[PDB]
Design a protein around this motif. Structure first.
Motif, PDB file in Angstrom:
ATOM      1  N   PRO A  20       1.149  -1.067   0.090  1.00 47.68           N
ATOM      2  CA  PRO A  20       0.120   0.613  -0.071  1.00 47.68           C
ATOM      3  C   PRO A  20       1.299   1.051   0.177  1.00 47.68           C
ATOM      4  CG  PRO A  20      -0.790  -1.157   2.007  1.00 47.68           C
ATOM      5  CD  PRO A  20       0.421  -1.546   1.463  1.00 47.68           C
ATOM      6  N   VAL A  21       0.484   1.861  -0.412  1.00 52.24           N
ATOM      7  CA  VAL A  21       0.983   3.541  -0.665  1.00 52.24           C
ATOM      8  C   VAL A  21       0.874   3.709   0.809  1.00 52.24           C
ATOM      9  CG1 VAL A  21       0.776   3.623  -3.376  1.00 52.24           C
ATOM     10  CG2 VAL A  21      -0.696   4.951  -2.022  1.00 52.24           C
ATOM     11  N   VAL A  22       1.610   5.011   0.856  1.00 55.48           N
ATOM     12  CA  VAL A  22       1.400   5.847   2.349  1.00 55.48           C
ATOM     13  C   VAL A  22       0.453   7.135   1.470  1.00 55.48           C
ATOM     14  CG1 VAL A  22       2.016   7.992   3.892  1.00 55.48           C
ATOM     15  CG2 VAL A  22       3.086   4.955   3.675  1.00 55.48           C
ATOM     16  N   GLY A  28      -1.849   8.479  23.156  1.00 62.88           N
ATOM     17  CA  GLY A  28      -1.573   7.542  22.384  1.00 62.88           C
ATOM     18  C   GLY A  28      -0.787   6.967  21.082  1.00 62.88           C
ATOM     19  N   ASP A  29       0.236   6.326  20.700  1.00 67.57           N
ATOM     20  CA  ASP A  29       0.122   6.490  18.472  1.00 67.57           C
ATOM     21  C   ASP A  29      -0.038   4.927  18.415  1.00 67.57           C
ATOM     22  OD1 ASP A  29       1.152   7.447  16.901  1.00 67.57           O
ATOM     23  OD2 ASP A  29       3.626   6.470  17.153  1.00 67.57           O
ATOM     24  N   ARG A  30      -0.186   4.598  17.336  1.00 64.43           N
ATOM     25  CA  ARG A  30      -1.435   3.901  16.834  1.00 64.43           C
ATOM     26  C   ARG A  30      -0.233   3.494  16.212  1.00 64.43           C
ATOM     27  NH1 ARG A  30      -6.046   5.989  15.812  1.00 64.43           N
ATOM     28  NH2 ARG A  30      -5.147   7.526  15.227  1.00 64.43           N
ATOM     29  N   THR A  31       0.643   2.241  15.408  1.00 65.39           N
ATOM     30  CA  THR A  31       1.159   1.678  14.619  1.00 65.39           C
ATOM     31  C   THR A  31       0.330   0.083  13.392  1.00 65.39           C
ATOM     32  OG1 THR A  31       2.742  -0.373  15.034  1.00 65.39           O
ATOM     33  CG2 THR A  31       2.904   1.772  15.507  1.00 65.39           C
ATOM     34  N   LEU A  32       0.583   1.049  12.782  1.00 67.44           N
ATOM     35  CA  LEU A  32       0.253  -0.370  11.357  1.00 67.44           C
ATOM     36  C   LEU A  32       1.236  -0.412  10.178  1.00 67.44           C
ATOM     37  CD1 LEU A  32      -2.282  -1.964  10.513  1.00 67.44           C
ATOM     38  CD2 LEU A  32      -3.005  -0.090   8.758  1.00 67.44           C
ATOM     39  N   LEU A  33       1.288  -1.796  10.153  1.00 67.28           N
ATOM     40  CA  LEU A  33       1.995  -2.496   9.240  1.00 67.28           C
ATOM     41  C   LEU A  33       1.754  -3.697   8.605  1.00 67.28           C
ATOM     42  CD1 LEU A  33       5.639  -2.974   8.478  1.00 67.28           C
ATOM     43  CD2 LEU A  33       5.082  -5.024   9.885  1.00 67.28           C
ATOM     44  N   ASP A  34       1.132  -2.874   6.947  1.00 62.89           N
ATOM     45  CA  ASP A  34       0.539  -4.073   6.485  1.00 62.89           C
ATOM     46  C   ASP A  34       0.331  -3.557   4.646  1.00 62.89           C
ATOM     47  OD1 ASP A  34      -0.041  -1.516   5.355  1.00 62.89           O
ATOM     48  OD2 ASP A  34      -1.703  -0.649   5.489  1.00 62.89           O
ATOM     49  N   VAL A  35      -0.263  -5.285   4.341  1.00 67.77           N
ATOM     50  CA  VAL A  35       0.066  -5.328   2.589  1.00 67.77           C
ATOM     51  C   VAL A  35      -0.861  -5.968   2.131  1.00 67.77           C
ATOM     52  CG1 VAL A  35       1.170  -7.911   3.387  1.00 67.77           C
ATOM     53  CG2 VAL A  35       1.954  -6.671   1.315  1.00 67.77           C
ATOM     54  N   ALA A  87       7.198  -6.636   0.165  1.00 65.35           N
ATOM     55  CA  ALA A  87       7.108  -5.422   1.184  1.00 65.35           C
ATOM     56  C   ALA A  87       6.320  -4.249   1.993  1.00 65.35           C
ATOM     57  CB  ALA A  87       7.663  -4.445  -0.238  1.00 65.35           C
ATOM     58  N   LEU A  88       6.754  -4.011   2.503  1.00 64.78           N
ATOM     59  CA  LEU A  88       4.996  -4.067   4.137  1.00 64.78           C
ATOM     60  C   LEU A  88       5.516  -2.477   3.904  1.00 64.78           C
ATOM     61  CD1 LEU A  88       6.003  -6.527   6.812  1.00 64.78           C
ATOM     62  CD2 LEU A  88       4.465  -7.107   4.988  1.00 64.78           C
ATOM     63  N   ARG A  89       3.599  -2.216   4.119  1.00 65.07           N
ATOM     64  CA  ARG A  89       4.143  -0.331   4.177  1.00 65.07           C
ATOM     65  C   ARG A  89       3.579  -0.333   5.604  1.00 65.07           C
ATOM     66  NH1 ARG A  89      -0.680   1.651   6.298  1.00 65.07           N
ATOM     67  NH2 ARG A  89      -1.893   1.458   4.207  1.00 65.07           N
ATOM     68  N   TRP A  90       4.763   0.785   6.220  1.00 66.81           N
ATOM     69  CA  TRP A  90       4.551   0.586   7.791  1.00 66.81           C
ATOM     70  C   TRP A  90       3.483   1.995   8.260  1.00 66.81           C
ATOM     71  CZ3 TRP A  90       7.003   4.396  10.594  1.00 66.81           C
ATOM     72  CH2 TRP A  90       6.438   4.414  12.552  1.00 66.81           C
ATOM     73  N   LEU A  91       3.428   2.686   9.441  1.00 64.33           N
ATOM     74  CA  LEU A  91       2.355   3.760   9.319  1.00 64.33           C
ATOM     75  C   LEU A  91       2.377   4.093  10.730  1.00 64.33           C
ATOM     76  CD1 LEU A  91      -0.216   5.242   6.557  1.00 64.33           C
ATOM     77  CD2 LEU A  91      -0.472   4.676   9.240  1.00 64.33           C
ATOM     78  N   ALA A  92       2.763   5.523  11.480  1.00 72.50           N
ATOM     79  CA  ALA A  92       2.391   5.601  12.736  1.00 72.50           C
ATOM     80  C   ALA A  92       1.008   6.917  12.405  1.00 72.50           C
ATOM     81  CB  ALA A  92       2.984   5.575  13.189  1.00 72.50           C
ATOM     82  N   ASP A  93       0.272   6.760  13.537  1.00 74.60           N
ATOM     83  CA  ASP A  93      -0.563   8.160  14.152  1.00 74.60           C
ATOM     84  C   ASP A  93      -0.906   8.139  15.208  1.00 74.60           C
ATOM     85  OD1 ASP A  93      -2.608  10.544  12.877  1.00 74.60           O
ATOM     86  OD2 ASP A  93      -3.768   9.111  12.309  1.00 74.60           O
ATOM     87  N   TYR A  94      -0.743   9.724  15.505  1.00 75.53           N
ATOM     88  CA  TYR A  94      -1.315   9.837  17.135  1.00 75.53           C
ATOM     89  C   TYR A  94      -2.844  10.388  17.419  1.00 75.53           C
ATOM     90  CZ  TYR A  94      -0.672  12.037  21.593  1.00 75.53           C
ATOM     91  OH  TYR A  94      -0.495  12.617  22.784  1.00 75.53           O
ATOM     92  N   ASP A  95      -2.969   9.557  18.320  1.00 72.32           N
ATOM     93  CA  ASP A  95      -4.695   8.908  19.001  1.00 72.32           C
ATOM     94  C   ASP A  95      -4.467  10.086  20.443  1.00 72.32           C
ATOM     95  OD1 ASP A  95      -6.906   8.787  18.308  1.00 72.32           O
ATOM     96  OD2 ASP A  95      -7.469   6.806  19.520  1.00 72.32           O
TER      97      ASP A  95
END
Lengths: 54, 54
Positions: free
Chosen positions: B16-18, B47-54, B34-42
């Motif tokens: 996935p694209v960021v 707190g922080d949230r991280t997603l690692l997806d494909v 290749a895995l897409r990593w992503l982070a977002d602050y709640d």
């Protein structure tokens, strides 16, 4: 009036860490205490939210 | 036990694209995938949230 020796009272401070997913914030100081500043956009509420913490 | 020819099974992967609104993330690998990593602050959950997806 209060008369105390240095060892009577203890204060501890820790600056919170700005996480990976938060937009890079600033840093401030209150009387020599490092405060973390953070801003996040609430799209669902159409606004900005700031937090300044220690 | 399974005995198969090379042409029997097919795997396909897409990273996935960021998006524009996401703070720019990293890209990791898993078995050559290749895995897409992503982070977002709640802010709401503080707190922080991280997603690692494909």
């Amino acid at each position: 009036a209060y008369l105390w020796h240095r060892t009577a009272f203890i204060l501890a401070y820790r600056t919170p860490v700005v996480p990976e997913g938060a937009k890079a914030g600033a840093s401030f100081s209150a009387n020599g205490v490092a405060l973390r500043w953070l801003a996040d956009y609430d799209y669902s509420q159409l606004g900005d939210r700031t937090l300044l913490d220690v």
